[PDB]
Amino acid sequence: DTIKVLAIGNSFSQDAVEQYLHELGEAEGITMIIGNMFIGGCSLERHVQNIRNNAPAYAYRKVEKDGEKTETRSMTIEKALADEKWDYISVQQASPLSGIYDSYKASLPELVNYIRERIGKETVLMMHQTWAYATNANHTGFKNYDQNQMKMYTSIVDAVKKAANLVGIKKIIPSGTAIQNARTSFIGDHMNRDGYHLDLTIGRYTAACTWFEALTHRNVTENPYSPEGIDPIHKKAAQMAAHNAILYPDKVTELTELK
């Protein structure tokens, strides 16, 4: 089959969908057309500003059916929504605000209303639950969570759940939990490349594995794709972290077999 999925986001949706996800699908015979609407650091408030003025403010990164990766500049949300008959569309908050429910309360309903007016009843609208920062991250946003990884993580889980209920979204892609699960394994607190964005190999792959299982409902621990540059034991830890996040999206599952 084919899965057409669009993320409305920023560098954190980029970390999940712009690489690995297509390969994961391809290895199971699933073709996937992936779009990512990117503005650096973009929050829900800024997405709402852009839908109010139909701003051509986004870089549109697409992974085509054959795996080619293209960018189109100066894109609007309206145009992105009409680019494919999307099976799935995600929205998310900027990481500094990702565990602050009131930031979703203020902007998410207007954004979601705008999208719902431009899709059919077969399209699934989703939240992308993003991840806490590394424990020693220097990112200024981390102060919102007392520079404590677990506090941040727990705040994100809670905010996203409540935000989904606010706007009537039922499906959440639990990337934050998958990252947090990976951090309990022998991998430890080595899932980031700059304290907040994901590690380019294992980090991004763990997020992609979570998206793969969320969209295809196939157990990613059985997926045959072997990414280059990730050794087999790390690959298996990534897959298990993602699969446990899908099963148990609201809490850390200790990867005790891999410690």
- The answer to whether the beta carbons of residues 197 and 134 sit under 8 Å apart is no
Cα 213–chain centre separation: 12
What number of other Cβ atoms are within 10 A of residue 117's Cβ?
8
Running DSSP on this structure, what letter comes out for residue 89? Answer: E
The total of other beta-carbon atoms located within 10 Å of residue 191's CB is 24
Rounded to 5°, the CA angle 61-65-71 comes to 15
Beta bridge partners of residue 59, listed in sequence order: 38
Q: What's the CA gap between 197 and 192, in Å, rounded?
A: 5
Look at residues 75, 170, 72, 78 and name the one whose alpha carbon lies nearest to residue 119.
Answer: 78
Sequence-ordered strand ranges (E) for the chain: 2-9, 31-38, 58-63, 69-75, 88-91, 124-129, 171-174
Enumerate residues 6+ apart whose C-beta is below 8 A from 66.
none
Nearest C-alpha neighbor of 154 from the set 126, 132, 183: 132
Report whether 201 contacts 230 (CB < 8 A). Answer: yes
The number of angstroms, rounded, from the C-alpha of 219 to the middle of its chain's C-alpha atoms is: 18
β-strand 58-63 against 69-75: which pairing, if any? antiparallel
In words, the CATH class of domain 1-259 is: alpha beta
**Which of 145, 209, 140, 144 shows the shortest CA–CA distance to 173?**
209
Sheet with strand 2-9: strands edge to edge:
69-75, 58-63, 31-38, 2-9, 88-91, 124-129, 171-174
Give dist(CA 199, CA 191) in Å, integer: 5
End-to-end CA distance of the chain: 37
